[PDB]
Amino acid sequence: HMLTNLVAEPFAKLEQDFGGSIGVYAMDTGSGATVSYRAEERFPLCSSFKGFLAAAVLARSQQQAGLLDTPIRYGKNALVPWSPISEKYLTTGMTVAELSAAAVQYSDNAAANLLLKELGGPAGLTAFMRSIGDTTFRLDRWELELNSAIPGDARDTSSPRAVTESLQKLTLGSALAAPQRQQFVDWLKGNTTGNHRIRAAVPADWAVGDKTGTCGVYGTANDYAVVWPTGRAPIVLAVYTRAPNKDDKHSEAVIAAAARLALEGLGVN
Ligand SMILES: Cn1c(=O)cc(CP(=O)(O)O)c2cc(F)c(C3CC3)cc21
Known part of the structure; x- marks a missing residue:
């Protein structure tokens, strides 16, 4: 519900200092109050698809x-x-649950590709998100x-708003059965x-x-x-960045600062 204007100027200053684009969407699940900055624009997912991948595996587990x-x-x-867990279990194998935990918690690439194969590839994960x-x-x-994060390339992207909406449905809504949701x-x-990143903006008691x-x-x-x-009530938020030049560096500090501004906009402690 607006709230953005409490922090539209601070966001524009942050992204001017960063030298690229910042996209934010944050939802207070209590009031439905939102904060939006470039929330509709596409940004590359990079490893962030691995959380949705794990959620799709859990949704399949309800049937299988x-x-x-x-x-x-x-x-x-x-x-x-960047396969830090799967490299330790090459000689043994791992379970689907273990691969899902590695993909989420260590961003494990081999685990991600093995679970994509289980779902029928990138189109399979896209199909789950459409569902x-x-x-x-x-x-x-x-x-x-x-x-590759090529400027203007829509492949392998989403918007901060769509990411937040989907995360809310999977973690707090009814897209997963209760046991799967808690997993x-x-x-x-x-x-x-x-x-x-966002954790750097969150108090230790939350x-x-x-x-x-x-x-x-x-x-x-x-x-x-x-x-x-x-x-x-819980807050759901997404913070995405990109920049114009191939050898522009990302900034974890800019992601934490953006997260802080989103929480400040929502009036959160
Ligand atoms: C540079 N880098 C990080 O610094 C950190 C993660 C972990 P995350 O932040 O993506 O979850 C990382 C993961 C990757 F798959 C890749 C591949 C492009 C080469 C790079 C990563």
């Missing part, structure tokens, strides 16, 4: 009772860069090609890669689950989170 316990074996050629009423999300490619929340709460993304080019990186402040 054995799915999460299924052992998956893989070869050395599956171990693309919960997200018409904006698109995944087009696999790891690592989906990280998704617990995976996000256990994320290890987000300490310098619960938070998040999923990061970092493309490594074009100043492109992001984070989305559900935050449970004490004594009020």
Whole structure:
């Protein structure tokens, strides 16, 4: 409900200092009050699709009772860069649940590609997002090609608003069965890669689950989170960045600052 104007000028100054574009959408699930800045624009997902990927696996698990316990074996050629958990279990395999936890909590790339294969590829994950009423999300490619973050390329993008809307449906709404919903929340709460992003803007006595993304080019990186402040309804928010030049660097500090401004706009402690 507006609230944006409490912080439209501060956001424009932050992105002028960063040297690129910042996109924010934050929802107070209590009042329905929102904060929006470039909330409709497309930004590259980078690794952030891995949280939605885990949610799609959990949705499939509601239909296929054995799915999460299924052992998956893989070869050395599956171990693309940034596979910190799957590289330790090459010789043993891992379960679908373990791959899902690795994809969410360590951004594990081999795990992400193996679970994409289970869902029928990038189109399969896109299909799941359409099934919960997200018409904006698109995944087009696999790891690592989906990280190209080419300016104006809609492949492998979504909008901050669509990301927040979908995250709310999956973590707090009715898109997942209750046990699956709590598993998704617990995976996000256990994320290890987000300490310098939205988490850096959240007090220690508030619960938070998040999923990061970092493309490594074009100043492109992001984070989305559900935050449970004490004594009020949860907040859902998405913070995405990009920049014009290929060797522009992302900034975790800019993502934490954007998160702070969003929470300040919502009037949150
Ligand atoms: C540079 N970088 C990070 O610095 C950090 C993560 C973890 P996340 O922030 O994406 O979750 C990272 C993940 C990746 F898949 C990639 C591939 C493009 C090469 C790069 C990453």
